[PDB]
């Protein structure tokens, strides 16, 4: 027996408390690094969350594997996109500040 | 005279074509007992005897008469009819289960799930049993209060929306709370491998603390809370 | 035949009933390596035993120091010397062994400072053979012992390959040449019919309170095994003896346990006096289940009523500490509030004495072997057993001592198993069967299923209940007992007239409740007839006209210069009732109670005495 | 007969039968907790969808971010509409944020008794409105 399921569940809350720690950390300290860690925490926590919805509603054998594959695609493309936006544009924190004072 | 309407789910598996619908009944409350079971039994004995349902203790301790009364899962002999004659009582079978006939659900899966958690004491040394009473301090015994009182209604799990969509692979609160009941029984030597049986996505982990179980419990028990303790234990238990 | 599918089954043993006793016998059998079918009309956990509150007796000596022989004395004394000492000995002797085994299974008994099982004071139990004050020996799981008892037994039974025929209503016994071959059963789920046949057949159906209008017992206590037996020509024993539990709500008749009286609770009548001290001084309000209720029931006739129409009495729990009510008796705090609207800590409970227990039943060995009465002599029915409330080894006699039937269940469950385990091997010859055996039950099933008579099932049930309620009540005279007999007798005719409305195969509760009614009516017929015949006042059966307690001797004065009465001139004997199912006629004979124990040198025979608490 | 075999039977019996499914959502009356869980999923899904639609458009679409804000000014800054569009972005976020803490507290094993649950529910609900109005005005 490996304690996988439970370890996963633990990670979920670690990132949940990590993401809570970042929304005030972003506002109080907007920077290069924060932009990435925010993107990282954002894309994982969402990936697992949707995963939890899928492995709840998406009933079946073939479709369960499908949804999970297409979700890994959406995630990969999401994290990478947000990283591109950081490196080549203003960076999440600055984008927020701009979008806002408007 | 004081009349109360009763809208009840109906299905005869023995009349062809006939599919699910509600039937309305009318009962004088001066001639009827205060509980909804009393009502059911009365219409069964006086009006229509096709009305088929489960019953026994009429005391709310056997869990036979579990059903969904007015959009919530309780016991018909414990729920009292709302003396309000301006409402119509909607009586339904325990939600999202196979209707065998009328208000009678197929609980065999529910039970089979109970079986798979092994609800009995397990000693690493069954070689000395039946000859000496096992020692357990009143403190260690208090940990069972609020757990051992479960009647196995199926009000519980049949209110959990995870158990609606995943009832086949997700054990649901009733069953789960009992597994907990055997983890914290200080006399049980199998506390660890009892957790290993839940190490997969569905057994325990379909719970999302929706809290419809605790809310719906006819006995005032708290399966949801007990579940949370399992979840904690699962994340903390060694080896 | 063309209508019904016959599906046969082959086992080593069938247990009919998944209550306390049934279960214990069931897995007990499987444990000894027996392939054991267990047929039950309810899912095990629903079996009445859940309802049990008080507790289970064992002289483990956890409070003070006890001796199972004092528990022996107390049972036999409370039995009013109709109790068969051989069986009583076996039970009390085996008591601490059985209760320890249950706690080892995992029954969460409430605990003491020591960390041992909590034992409680209860009705009629003493130390030093009735001279050492109150004995505290009721082992219990808070207020819900029967619940925990049933649940762990069920729980423990899953460990073995017991074949559970769940929600299958047994119809009759499969009987060939005086020997039992199994059971013919209706499967409620799909309306099918199943001849389950085995070498040994344990009947463990429990009581028949539902013959009365006001009883503590569940809607499914319909003495179905008791009937099944009298439909096979076998006798039932002591069916008049019906225990009226002193306490239970005026309306629905729910049980408020005797554990209320054993924990310091009192009984209050209209004027306010603790009337249980002017009626019974020696042992006070913790007396026998028949003396207390007798005190109450006549007090109501005295004009001392305590309700809207002065037809009941009170049980007060005002004085007890609030901290002890929630800990020792939690399940009555709920049910007193729920059914009556009573906060237990600062209010009394409206309690009438209502029917509760059936001492009578299927005549039985201390081994559990069902008896027939051939030539004034006993005889073992081959491959047939009975245990618990359905049965009558009469470890209880004329009056069940409180907190003993739960024990009765467990001991004689076990016993029924060992009796088989030690009289044959598993995988032995399962006796063959006539191709068309049980023909009668299916035929009876069809007649009751498509029954388009004139009397509705529920109304006939009602007339029986109320007829029993007023003719064979607590107190009963030969005047009103006689009228009750021929009134019940008319109502047996009326069964040929009855109307049922549901014609389905799936869950025809309309059909089964009617089979329950025949099962009831047979139990009723023998109850009222045995009652009319018994012209003495023993235990729960108290005659107004025959207040005397008729023993073989006059046991008040010394036993010396005075000659024994001939058998058919005293009433210290068991009632054996039969009924020709067609004419519905009760013929009844008698068999002597066993007085010898299993070892005079270990457990002395206790001779009849003047009995009062 | 093992528990796994009982289950297999159960399904093969019912899925090969003419039996119906006793109504669930259609009849089960709604409690504040139960609605507050759907909303967590409602918001949780939408938020992930938003984020994804921000990262993907940062990979597939023309122009930079500054090139998009100037583009946003189409019918442009209309205070009591560009505030309204702003509010309804923070609202699901703030709810899911606050209720998230509630879920997190639960995982510790705290506040799981019917009263406590319908109290903290209101506290999360009220907190959303305050921190939503408060942020859209920052
Ligand atoms: C009525 C009662 C009794 C009682 C009590 C409270 C109430 C309300 N409290 C007690 C207590 O606190 N302490 C104690 O010592 N005793 C107490 N009692 C008495 C005692 O509980 C009963 O004598 C005991 O429960 C009887 O047990 P038993 O196993 O003999 O019978 P059962 O539990 O009622 O179970 C019946 C089983 O048989 C099956 N059945 C019945 N008919 C059929 C048919 N026709 N076909 C197939 N199966 C049948 C039922 O399904 C059930 O499993
Ligand atoms: C820092 C603030 C946040 C906190 C504290 C938080 C916390 C949580 C927690 C604890 C859960 C799981 C609880 C459960 O249902 O068992 C959850 C679910 C979820 N969250 Fe978050 N979250 C936050 C922000 C976000 C963001 C920004 C997104 C979008 C990327 C998001 C998307 C999701 C999704 C998709 C789920 C799963 C939905 C479900 O199955 O119920 N959350 N959140
Ligand atoms: C957090 O998990 C959940 N919480 C719920 O309240 C829940 C539900 O309430 C369901 C009865 C249905 C509801 C309309 C869903 Cl489909 C919208 Cl989210 C539901 O289906 C669910 O997924 C298992
Ligand atoms: S825990 Fe409560 S709701 Fe769940 S089955 Fe038991 S009694 Fe019913
Ligand atoms: S109804 Fe539900 S998902 Fe968990 S908290 Fe209760 S089992
Ligand atoms: S019948 Fe026993 S709980 Fe309603």
CB C458 within 8 A of CB C213: no
**Can you tell me whether residue C357 is helix, strand or coil?**
strand
Is the Cβ pair A56, B231 closer than 8 Å? no
- Provide DSSP, C56-71: EE----SSS---HHHH
Q: What is the CA radius of gyration of chain B?
A: 21
Is the Cβ pair D55, A77 closer than 8 Å? yes
Nearest to C141 by CA among C326, C328, C406: C328
Nearest to D67 by CA among C188, A85, C109, B193: A85
- The first and second tokens of residue C433, run together, are 């069967």
CB C189 within 8 A of CB B105: no
CA–CA dist C77, C357 (Å, integer): 18
CB of B60 within 6 A of ligand 6: the answer is yes
What are the Cα distances from residue C455, in Å, to B45, B46, C323, C452, C503?
Answer: 12, 12, 53, 9, 17
CB A64 within 8 A of CB A70: no
- The first and second tokens of residue D94, run together, are 């703030």
CB of B54 within 6 A of ligand 6: the answer is no
Nearest to B190 by CA among B133, B121, B130: B121
Task: Give B80→chain A minimum CA distance, Å.
Answer: 36
Consecutive H or E run containing C16:
strand C9-16
CB of B76 within 6 A of ligand 6: the answer is yes
Consecutive H or E run containing C348:
strand C348-351
CA–CA dist B234, A12 (Å, integer): 14
Q: Class assignment of domain D31-138?
A: mainly alpha
Phi, psi of C12 (to 5 degrees): -85, -35
**Can you tell me whether residue A51 is helix, strand or coil?**
helix
**C272 annotated ligand binder:** no
Residues 6+ apart with CB under 8 A from A21: none
- The first and second tokens of residue C320, run together, are 């007890």
Angle at C109 between CA C84 and CA C165, to 5 degrees: 70
Nearest to C328 by CA among C257, C268, C267, C274: C257
CA–CA dist A23, D97 (Å, integer): 10
State which CATH number among 3.90.105.10, 3.90.1300.10, 2.60.40.1930, 3.90.700.10 fits the domain covering C249-352: 3.90.700.10
User: Which technique was the structure solved with, according to the deposited record?
Assistant: X-ray
CB C242 within 8 A of CB C358: yes
CB of D25 within 6 A of ligand 3: the answer is yes
What are the Cα distances from residue C409, in Å, to C20, C135, C242, C258?
Answer: 6, 22, 18, 18
Residues of D in contact with C163 (CB under 8 A): 1
For residue C462, the chain B residue with the least C-alpha distance is B45
Phi, psi of C574 (to 5 degrees): -85, 145
Nearest to C180 by CA among C229, C216, C123: C229
Strands C455-456, C498-499: pairing kind: parallel
Q: Name the burial class of residue C570, with classes exposed (0-12), middle (13-18) and buried (19+) by CB atoms within 10 angstroms of its CB.
A: middle
Q: How many CB atoms lie within 10 A of CB A29?
A: 10
Residues 6+ apart with CB under 8 A from C393: C84, C87, C364, C365, C366, C368, C412
Residues 6+ apart with CB under 8 A from C4: C192, C193, C442, C445, C446
Nearest to B155 by CA among B215, B205, B102: B215
CB C398 within 8 A of CB C373: no
CB C56 within 8 A of CB C139: yes
Nearest to C238 by CA among C345, C84, C385: C84
Chain B contacts in chain A segment 46-65 (CB below 8 A): 52, 55-57, 59
- Please, what's the b/e burial string for C329-363 (b: 16 or more CB within 10 A of its CB; e: otherwise)? bbbbbbbbebbbebebeebbbbbbbbbbbbbbbbb
The span from the first CA to the last CA of chain C, in angstroms, equals 59
CA–CA dist C169, B168 (Å, integer): 29
Residues 6+ apart with CB under 8 A from A78: A43, A46, A47, D51, D52, D55, D56
CA–CA dist C13, C29 (Å, integer): 8
**A45 annotated ligand binder:** yes
CA–CA dist D76, D133 (Å, integer): 21
Residue positions of C annotated with a catalytic role = 289
Residues of B in contact with A59 (CB under 8 A): 165
**Which residues does residue C268 pair with via DSSP β-bridges, in sequence order?**
C314
Task: Give D65→chain A minimum CA distance, Å.
Answer: 7
CB B170 within 8 A of CB B112: no
CA–CA dist C315, C39 (Å, integer): 39
Instruction: Give domain C1-248+353-431's CATH architecture.
Output: 3-Layer(bba) Sandwich (3.50)
Q: Find tokens 């009759």 and name the residue.
A: C172
Chain breaks in chain D (C to N over 2.5 A) after: none
Consecutive H or E run containing C183:
strand C179-187
Dihedral (CA of C420, C423, C426, C427) sign: negative
CB of B171 within 6 A of ligand 4: the answer is no
Helices D3-14 and B108-115 pack at an angle, to 10 degrees, of 160
- Structural domain boundaries in chain D: 1-30, 31-138
The fold of B1-106 is Ubiquitin-like (UB roll) (3.10.20)
CB C101 within 8 A of CB B130: yes
**For the CA of C338, the nearest ligand:** 6
CB C96 within 8 A of CB C40: no
- The first and second tokens of residue A65, run together, are 């594997």
CB of C147 within 6 A of ligand 1: the answer is no
Q: How far is the CA of B78 from the centre of ligand 6 (A)?
A: 8
What are the Cα distances from residue C177, in Å, to C209, C495, C577?
Answer: 32, 29, 21
CB C208 within 8 A of CB C29: no
- The first and second tokens of residue C238, run together, are 């002591």
CA–CA dist D30, B71 (Å, integer): 8
Give the binding-site residues of ligand 2, using a 6 Å CB cut-off.
A 16, 19-20, 23, 42, 45-46, 49-50, 52-53; B 208; D 40-41, 44-45, 47-48, 51, 96-97, 100-101, 103-104
Pocket of ligand 2, candidates A11, A14, A16: which has the most ligand atoms within 8 Å of its Cβ, to mutate? A16
CA–CA dist C240, A76 (Å, integer): 81
Q: Whose CA is nearest to atom 26 of ligand 2?
A: D47
Phi, psi of B224 (to 5 degrees): -55, -45
Nearest to C381 by CA among C392, C373, C370: C370
Q: Name the burial class of residue B161, with classes exposed (0-12), middle (13-18) and buried (19+) by CB atoms within 10 angstroms of its CB.
A: buried
CA–CA dist C239, A17 (Å, integer): 70
Q: Find tokens 């004092």 and name the residue.
A: C70
CA–CA dist B88, C609 (Å, integer): 63
CATH number of D1-30: 1.20.5.540
The superfamily CATH assigns to domain B107-239 is Alpha-helical ferredoxin (1.10.1060.10)
The number of residues in chain A equals 102
**Which residues does residue C111 pair with via DSSP β-bridges, in sequence order?**
C117
- Alpha helix positions (H), C241-339: 291-301, 322-328, 330-339
CB C452 within 8 A of CB C499: yes
Is the Cβ pair D21, B209 closer than 8 Å? no
- CA of A56, closest atom in ligand 3: 23
Residues of C in contact with D1 (CB under 8 A): 161, 163
> Domain of A76: which CATH number?
1.20.1300.10
Strands of C119-126's sheet, edge to edge? C56-57, C134-139, C119-126
The number of residues in chain D equals 138
CB C433 within 8 A of CB C197: yes
CA–CA dist C577, C286 (Å, integer): 33
- Domain extent at residue A78: 1-102
- The first and second tokens of residue C469, run together, are 């309620």
Least CB–CB distance from D33: residue in B13, B106, B210: B210
- The first and second tokens of residue D28, run together, are 């089960």
Chain breaks in chain B (C to N over 2.5 A) after: none
Q: What is the three-state SS of B135-189?
A: CCCHHHHHCCCCCCCCCCCCCCCCCCHHHHHHCCCCCCHHHHHHHHHHHCCCCCC
CB B54 within 8 A of CB C273: no
Chain breaks in chain C (C to N over 2.5 A) after: none
Task: Give C159→chain D minimum CA distance, Å.
Answer: 10
- The first and second tokens of residue C53, run together, are 């509150």
The count of structural domains within chain A is 1
Angle at A66 between CA A60 and CA A70, to 5 degrees: 145
Residues of A in contact with B193 (CB under 8 A): 1
CB C135 within 8 A of CB C413: no
Residues 6+ apart with CB under 8 A from B199: A1, A2, A3, A4, A5, A6, B234
CA–CA dist B122, C410 (Å, integer): 21
Nearest to B179 by CA among B97, B114, B105, B128: B114
Q: Whose CA is nearest to atom 4 of ligand 6?
A: B65
Phi, psi of C387 (to 5 degrees): -150, 150
Phi, psi of C475 (to 5 degrees): -80, 145
CA–CA dist C576, C376 (Å, integer): 11
Nearest to B29 by CA among B78, B90, B79, B83: B83
Angle at C221 between CA C101 and CA B119, to 5 degrees: 35
The fold of C549-613 is Rhinovirus 14, subunit 4 (4.10.80)
CB C356 within 8 A of CB C218: no
What are the Cα distances from residue A95, in Å, to A31, A35, C56, C96, D51?
Answer: 11, 10, 74, 78, 13
The domain C432-548 having CATH identifier 1.20.58.100: the answer here is yes
Strands C348-351, C313-316: pairing kind: antiparallel
Give the binding-site residues of ligand 5, using a 6 Å CB cut-off.
B 159-160, 162, 173, 207-213, 224, 227
Phi, psi of B70 (to 5 degrees): 50, 45
Q: How far is the CA of C42 from the centre of ligand 5 (A)?
A: 28
The number of residues in chain B equals 239
CB of D119 within 6 A of ligand 3: the answer is no
C375: left (phi over 0), alpha (psi -120 to 50) or beta: left
């Amino acid at each position: 027996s490996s304690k996988a399921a439970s370890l996963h569940w633990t990670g979920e809350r670690v990132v949940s408390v990590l993401l809570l720690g970042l929304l005030p950390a972003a506002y109080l300290n907007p920077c290069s690094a924060m932009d990435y860690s925010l993107a990282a925490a954002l894309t994982l926590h969402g990936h697992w969350g949707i995963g939890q919805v899928v492995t709840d509603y998406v009933r079946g054998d073939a479709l369960q594997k499908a949804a999970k594959a297409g979700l890994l695609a959406l995630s990969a493309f999401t994290f990478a996109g947000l990283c591109y936006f950081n490196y080549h544009d203003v960076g999440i924190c600055k984008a927020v500040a701009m979008l806002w004072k408007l | 005279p004081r009349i109360k309407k009763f809208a009840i789910y109906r299905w005869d598996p023995d009349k062809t074509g006939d599919k699910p619908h509600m039937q309305t009944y009318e009962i004088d409350l001066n001639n009827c007992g205060p509980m909804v079971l009393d009502a059911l039994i009365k219409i069964k004995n006086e009006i229509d005897s096709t009305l088929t349902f489960r019953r026994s203790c009429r005391e709310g301790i056997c869990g036979s008469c579990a059903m969904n009364i007015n959009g919530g899962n309780t016991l018909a002999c414990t729920r009292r009819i709302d003396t309000n004659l301006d409402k119509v009582s909607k009586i339904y079978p325990l939600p999202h289960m196979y209707v065998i006939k009328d208000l009678v659900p197929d609980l065999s899966n529910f039970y089979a799930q109970y079986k798979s958690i092994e609800p009995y004491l397990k000693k690493k040394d069954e070689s000395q049993e039946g000859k000496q009473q096992y020692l357990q301090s009143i403190e260690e015994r208090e940990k069972l209060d609020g757990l051992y009182e479960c009647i196995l209604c199926a009000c519980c799990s049949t209110s959990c929306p995870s158990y609606w969509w995943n009832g086949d692979k997700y054990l649901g609160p009733a069953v789960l709370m009992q597994a907990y009941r055997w983890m914290i029984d200080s006399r049980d030597d199998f506390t660890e491998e009892r957790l290993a049986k839940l190490q997969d996505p569905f057994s325990l982990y379909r719970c999302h603390t929706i809290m419809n179980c605790t809310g719906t419990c006819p006995k005032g028990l708290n399966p949801g809370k007990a579940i949370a303790e399992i979840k904690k234990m699962m994340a903390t238990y060694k080896e | 035949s063309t209508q019904y599918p016959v599906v046969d089954h082959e086992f080593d043993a069938v247990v009919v009933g998944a209550g306390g006793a049934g279960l214990r016998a069931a897995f007990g059998l499987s444990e000894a390596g027996f392939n054991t079918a267990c047929v039950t009309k309810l899912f095990p956990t629903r079996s009445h035993t859940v309802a049990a509150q008080g507790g289970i007796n064992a002289a483990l000596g956890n409070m003070e120091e006890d001796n199972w022989r004092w528990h022996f004395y107390d049972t036999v004394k409370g039995s009013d010397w109709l109790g068969d000492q051989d069986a009583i000995h076996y039970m009390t002797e085996q008591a601490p062994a059985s209760v320890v085994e249950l706690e080892n299974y995992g029954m969460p008994f409430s605990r003491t400072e020591d960390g041992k099982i909590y034992q409680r004071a209860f009705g009629g139990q003493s130390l030093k053979f009735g001279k050492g004050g109150q004995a505290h020996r009721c082992c219990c799981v808070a207020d819900r012992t029967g619940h925990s008892l049933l649940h762990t037994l069920y729980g423990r039974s899953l460990r073995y390959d017991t074949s559970y025929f769940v929600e299958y209503f047994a119809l009759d016994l499969l009987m060939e040449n005086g020997e039992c071959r199994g059971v013919i059963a209706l499967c409620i789920e799909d309306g099918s019919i199943h001849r389950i046949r085995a070498r040994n057949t344990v009947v463990a159906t429990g009581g028949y309170g539902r013959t009365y209008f006001s009883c503590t017992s569940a809607h499914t206590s319909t003495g179905d095994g008791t009937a099944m037996v009298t439909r096979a020509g076998l006798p039932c024993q002591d069916l008049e003896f019906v225990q009226f539990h002193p306490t239970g709500i005026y309306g629905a008749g729910c049980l408020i346990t005797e554990g209320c009286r054993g924990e310091g609770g009192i009984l209050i009548n209209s004027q306010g006096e603790r009337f249980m001290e002017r009626y019974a001084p020696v042992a006070k309000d913790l007396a026998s289940r028949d003396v207390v209720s007798r005190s109450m029931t006549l007090e109501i006739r005295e004009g001392r009523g305590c309700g809207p129409e002065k037809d009941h009495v009170y049980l007060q729990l005002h004085h007890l500490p609030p901290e002890q009510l929630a800990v020792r008796l939690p399940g009555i705090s709920e049910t007193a509030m729920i059914f009556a609207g009573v906060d237990v800590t600062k209010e009394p409970i409206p309690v009438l004495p209502t029917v509760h227990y059936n001492m009578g039943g299927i005549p039985t060995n201390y081994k559990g072997q069902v008896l027939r009465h051939v030539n004034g002599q006993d005889q073992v029915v081959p491959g047939l057993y009975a245990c618990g409330e359905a049965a009558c080894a009469s470890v209880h006699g004329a009056n069940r001592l409180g907190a003993n039937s739960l024990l009765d269940l467990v001991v004689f469950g076990r016993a029924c198993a060992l009796s088989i385990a030690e009289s044959c091997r598993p995988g032995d010859k399962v006796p063959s069967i006539k191709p068309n055996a049980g023909e009668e039950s299916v035929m009876n099933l069809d007649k009751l299923r498509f029954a388009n008579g004139t009397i509705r099932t529920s109304e006939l049930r009602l007339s029986m209940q109320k007829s029993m309620q007023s003719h064979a009540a607590v107190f009963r005279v030969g005047s009103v007992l006689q009228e009750g007999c021929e009134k019940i007798l008319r109502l047996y005719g009326d069964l040929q007239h009855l109307k049922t409305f549901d014609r389905g195969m799936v869950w025809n509760t309309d059909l089964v409740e009617t089979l329950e009614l025949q099962n009831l009516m047979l139990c009723a017929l023998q109850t009222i007839y045995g009652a009319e015949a018994r012209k003495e006042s023993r235990g729960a059966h108290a005659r107004e006209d025959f207040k005397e307690r008729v023993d073989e001797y006059d046991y008040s004065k010394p036993i010396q210069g005075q000659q024994k009465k001939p058998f058919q001139e005293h009433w210290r004997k068991h009632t054996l009732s039969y009924v020709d199912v067609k004419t519905g006629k009760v013929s009844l004979e008698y068999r002597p109670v066993i007085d010898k124990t299993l070892n005079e040198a270990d457990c002395a025979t206790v001779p009849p005495a003047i009995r009062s608490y | 007969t093992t528990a796994k075999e009982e289950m297999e039977r159960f399904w093969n019996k019912n899925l090969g039968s003419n039996r119906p499914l006793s109504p669930h959502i259609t009849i089960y009356r709604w409690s504040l907790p139960m609605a507050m869980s759907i909303c967590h999923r409602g918001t949780g899904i939408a938020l992930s969808a938003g984020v994804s639609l921000f990262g993907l458009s940062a990979l597939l679409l023309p122009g930079n971010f500054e090139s998009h804000l100037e583009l946003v000014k189409s019918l442009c800054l209309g205070p009591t509409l560009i505030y309204t569009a702003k509010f309804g972005i923070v609202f699901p976020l703030m709810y899911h944020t606050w209720n998230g803490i509630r879920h997190l507290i639960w995982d510790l094993g705290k506040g799981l008794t019917i009263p406590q649950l319908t109290q903290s529910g209101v506290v999360v609900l009220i907190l959303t409105v305050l921190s939503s109005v408060g942020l859209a005005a920052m």
